[PDB]
Symmetry: C2
Subunit: 608 residues, 2 copies
């Protein structure tokens, strides 16, 4: 009998693929895979308490060191519970693979006329068909490893994303001659630098050489491409200012002399002025999503040509009514091509941008990231000022992950990073409850390594159960929780729209959160509270010194503003106006704005 | 200006549809609907802490008093987080409506070439297309109320189930003259009693009149059809024993003289013998799912003709290789038609079933529900004996909901219900974490009424956050938690297959659970523990007397058997026939219990 269980061959393939961690929850639909993986001993299975946390954890796991991880899901609700995590990986271009069990394959076909398959199964592939790069149900034992290899390759290639491989129970427990196993051979990798694209790189260099006020806009596509180490020499060779997307913040020292922050609808004031007064914008590896560019392309960088580099052709041309060069190219290949052209025998002389760099520094001097608008409201800790203080306690290898709300906004508008530190969240889908699973993924990727998790009283509830995973494995997760009596982001939304009482956003209107320090004690997690500045520095130093898990609640004003922010504003008449991207709220005086805008202010700004 | 916000017309429509509760979480995608509903003051919005809980709570809400509820979801993860609840409602035929927000309608169409819609939207209708009865994206303001009326009708029509109506943000906030609203008019209900179906009813009645050992197998389709009050008159007019499906347990007093329990793979020994020794089985409103009939139709009730009544034609014929009459008909219509023929002046003569009824009582005498197999092991309370004791503390209008695991299995194999009491769980999908949201739904359906929630250390974790919802609204939910060091059901699965060390199922193999009494205190919930019999009755009384939420941890053996159970037995391996439940009885006892004598498979075990 020269046959081997398919499950054992799948466990071998995971080792051959370099997959050292799987996150998931057991059930009859994957018990044979749990068994095979556990007995081989190469892949560590991390048991989570909700499958959603497994499909989120794999994402930050990959982002930490570039090793893919698997989510191991069972039949029925084991699979439906993972869908939110699949969508966030899809939205943020993060590679991962889901291996989902199912009922016996005699039930698993879409022509089955019954509402459900077998005892409790369904078509888990169809459900993620539009939010994943590839789905396949293995119905032949001999193709089980083929489809895993293909799923991993397709997750990683091009614009990365999640893939979904479903293996019915009976396929897992079947036995075959290992010699009959089929294997997937990846097609040849594409050559992006075609003559057409090469000519676009020449055009970009000519524009950079002539531009007086260039701005590079650098995004996480660069890191996904493996090109972040090229950015420092690129920027210094060009003498050009750069902005970083929120997802790209950790690619370049925030204090590098040519890096000027983050622009958008929650932009920094100085960054938005730099963007909006440029004469040439080169976006590389950034999606130019709505929160980065606002709501009207004709109001974006009105004095500028805009070029865009993206490996996804649909993303590269979505702004084609506005952009000039839409460059469909891997970001690393593009930067290397541009650097080579800078050293060409016939390279153009690069005109000085010294006057513009000086103007960029003047904007930052005029508009600090933490300014008068971030005063402690009624004496409460202002979250923006808290982020600035926290920033100074970062370790040299600090990793920071965030949930949504205050953690997302104050974090990305304030925090500074240097080489060796990392910053991660889920901005594509923007789901509450990401922060804790995100911390799990980082910690396991770094062999139980330290992670700072910036979280919120609302978002803490969605995946609250993962506190048990964190304690079970004694993970050194430093979990800050911003308490502000509920859903502060939505309080502002409904107040702006209706100017009435809160609905469904605070304790009086239907939403309350527990005392997380009392919950911490129940889970055996040390806990601290920062209610004022008195205890802040000493508490932060203690939190950072902890070697295991720790919770720190931070108390802020329940109505604190998030600003700067591009918000709707009333004209003197009373008409509502959505102002141009440079005119962030709370609004600066019109005479200051006039002087900050090369051509004077936009017509919309004149009457606000 | 005679125009009105679409969101305000939606809030009016909800009132006109009788929807008094919505469960959900706010976001930009549904902020206009939250505002309109709250300002109107008819529909109470219950804010949950995970959208999955909202889509589960609406199910038990409906099942309590028959009023549909809505789930109110926002863009993006607001919608994806609901899908598990949608599938459970689909699998268990429970009507509910999801109202989901989305991005501006200029982004929301499948031909959009980008991975995501607008800021963070996706095609929420496509994602539930195979696990819901109807999905529609409202792209015209004048159709928003039409699609809600249509969605409620299609949820309740025929075989009930969830519907999914997506309303983009800009549609909610638009303004239209109310007289431009279109309205949905439901077609006339179908008439199931064609001549062909009437002839089928006459065939059933003729088989019942002649059968010496009939068994009616009654399922939740009867309650969904509104026919449960016809069952006592039917049973007594026929003199026939009945079994109830797990979902149908609460439709008839468990101690009614003609009700003999629940058969299946986790059957009661007596119920399985009654089923397996009948000469005629009439299934009404029960799916005859795999956990009910086992793994081989040729081994099911081998001496019996089997007829099936189901409103879903695919369900009615799925066993057609084995059944005789497959009747596509509403369960109430069918029962009314059968009673009309029974009460007719020309009604046929019903042969006596008195001997069979006596044989059913003897089966129950020889094989009690809680038996010697359920002894307390190694100093731990046995969960089956605990359920029997807990049963004695039920209130007169008790409602019980369960999670999976011990709560599901010990509960459905032991607990008895009287008229007025209710029993609910999710059996079609069988998802862990259903218990707490299920309890939320019942409590709000009964104006913050009392509910007993039988739960588990593993299942508690999936929707642990709803403990905050319970305390916020001070819901009198009585939450029992069976502590058994992790995933006991899977411990048995993997031990049966591999006979080695546990993997991913207990503290040492990767899965641990918190101290729920310490967690209770952190949430300001009073907490008790039951470890032995001495404190049991006093603690159960205290739990039942509390006016607000309570937690009661019950400690059981971490490897306690679940039984009786149709298990695989090593002779080579054999899956025995449904009557031959494990732990196995002696072959001579089985021989005597089987009117035919035992099956070939059983003789060698
Ligand atoms: C409420 C809210 C407010 C926000 N405000 C802001 C704000 O003010 N400013 C801001 O900058 N962000 C903001 N964000 C985040 C922003 O909208 C995006 O979600 C994202 O963070 C932008 O970063 P990115 O383009 O680097 O990442 P992504 O959106 O993930 O884009 C990465 C891009 O890289 C491409 N790519 C992938 N692999 C490669 C490769 N190998 N080569 C080349 N290209 C590749 C992908 O196709 C994709 O288009 C906000 C988010 C939210 C939820
Ligand atoms: C591990 C496990 C073990 C189980 N063990 C058992 C067991 O031993 N015994 C047992 O009985 N159950 C058992 N169950 C549950 C069982 O498999 C089913 O899930 C269900 O509980 C059976 O009840 P039902 O047929 O009444 O409900 P459903 O499965 O919901 O079936 C209801 C049926 O009614 C039909 N219907 C709906 N509306 C109408 C109407 N108006 N008129 C007519 N028909 C209508 C529907 O089409 C459907 O077919 C188990 C479940 C699990 C997860
Ligand atoms: C799963 C999910 N449900 C709903 C939303 C909509 N939403 C966006 S922000 C927000 C409130 C965030 O509250 P909290 O985490 O407490 O943060 P805060 O703004 O108060 O700092 C909600 C409900 C979401 N993003 N994800
Ligand atoms: C969401 C989900 N994930 C996984 C499963 C698979 N599953 C079925 S039973 C079980 C263990 C249940 O453990 P617990 O709730 O502690 O109950 P016990 O059997 O120990 O009483 C699991 C993981 C499931 N049904 N639902
Ligand atoms: Mg909050
Ligand atoms: Mg358990």
């Amino acid at each position: 009998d020269n046959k081997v269980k398919v499950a054992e061959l799948v466990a071998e393939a995971l080792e051959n693929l370099g997959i050292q961690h799987a996150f998931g929850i057991i059930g009859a639909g994957n018990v044979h895979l749990f068994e095979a993986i556990a007995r081989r001993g190469y892949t560590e299975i991390v048991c989570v308490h909700h499958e959603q946390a497994a499909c989120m954890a794999v994402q930050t796991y990959y982002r930490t060191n570039g090793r893919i991880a698997a989510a191991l899901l069972t039949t029925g609700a084991g699979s439906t519970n993972g869908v939110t995590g699949v969508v966030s990986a899809w939205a943020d271009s993060i590679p991962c693979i889901v291996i989902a069990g199912n009922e016996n394959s005699k039930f698993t076909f879409p022509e089955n006329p019954l509402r459900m398959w077998g005892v409790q199964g369904y078509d888990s592939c169809q459900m993620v068909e539009r939010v994943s790069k590839y789905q396949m149900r293995v119905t032949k034992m001999e193709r089980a490893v083929y489809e895993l290899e293909k799923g991993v390759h397709l997750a990683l290639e091009g614009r990365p994303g999640p893939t979904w491989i479903e293996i019915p129970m009976d396929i897992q427990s079947g036995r075959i001659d290992p010699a009959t196993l089929e294997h997937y051979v990846a097609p040849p990798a594409p050559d992006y630098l075609t003559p057409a694209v090469a000519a676009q790189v020449d055009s970009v260099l000519a524009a950079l050489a002539k531009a007086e006020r260039p701005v590079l806009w650098l995004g996480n596509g660069i890191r996904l491409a493996g090109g972040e180490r090229l950015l420092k020499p690129l920027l210094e060779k060009l003498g050009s200012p750069a902005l970083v997307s929120w997802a790209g913040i950790d690619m370049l020292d925030s204090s590098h002399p040519l890096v000027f922050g983050r622009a958008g609808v929650y932009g920094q004031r100085a960054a938005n002025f730099i963007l909006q007064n440029s004469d040439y914008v080169l976006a590389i590896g950034t999606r130019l999503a709505i929160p980065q560019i606002g709501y009207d392309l004709n109001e974006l960088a009105r004095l500028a040509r805009i070029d865009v580099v993206d490996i996804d052709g649909d993303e590269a041309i979505k702004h084609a009514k506005r952009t000039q060069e839409n460059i469909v190219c891997d970001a690393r290949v593009f930067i290397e091509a541009l650097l080579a052209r800078l050293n060409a025998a016939d390279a153009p002389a690069i005109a000085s941008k010294a006057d513009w760099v000086a103007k960029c520094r003047a904007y930052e001097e005029q508009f600090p990231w933490v300014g008068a608008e971030h005063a402690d409201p009624e004496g409460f800790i202002n979250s923006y000022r808290f982020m600035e203080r926290l920033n100074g306690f970062f370790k040299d290898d600090q990793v920071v992950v965030t949930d949504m709300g205050t953690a997302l906004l104050s974090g990305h508008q304030v925090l500074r990073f240097k080489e060796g530190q990392r910053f991660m969240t889920s901005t594509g889908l923007g789901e509450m409850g990401y922060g804790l699973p995100a911390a799990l993924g980082v910690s396991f990727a770094n062999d139980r390594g330290e992670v700072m998790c910036l979280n919120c009283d609302g978002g803490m509830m969605m995946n609250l159960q993962e506190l048990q995973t964190m304690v079970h494995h004694n993970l050194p997760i430093k979990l800050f929780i911003f308490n502000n009596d509920g859903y502060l982001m939505i309080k502002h939304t409904q107040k702006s729209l209706f100017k009435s009482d809160y609905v469904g956003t605070d304790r009086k209107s239907g939403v309350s959160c527990p005392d997380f320090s009392r919950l911490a004690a129940a889970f055996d997690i040390p806990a601290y509270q920062i209610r004022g500045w008195d205890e802040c520095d000493a508490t932060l130093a203690k939190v950072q010194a902890h070697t295991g898990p720790v919770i720190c609640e931070v108390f802020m004003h329940p109505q604190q503003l998030f600003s700067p922010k591009l918000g709707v504003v009333s004209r003197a008449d009373g008409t509502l106006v959505s102002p141009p991207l440079e005119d962030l709220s709370p609004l600066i005086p019109r005479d200051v704005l006039e002087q900050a805008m090369i051509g004077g202010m936009h017509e919309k700004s004149k009457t606000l």
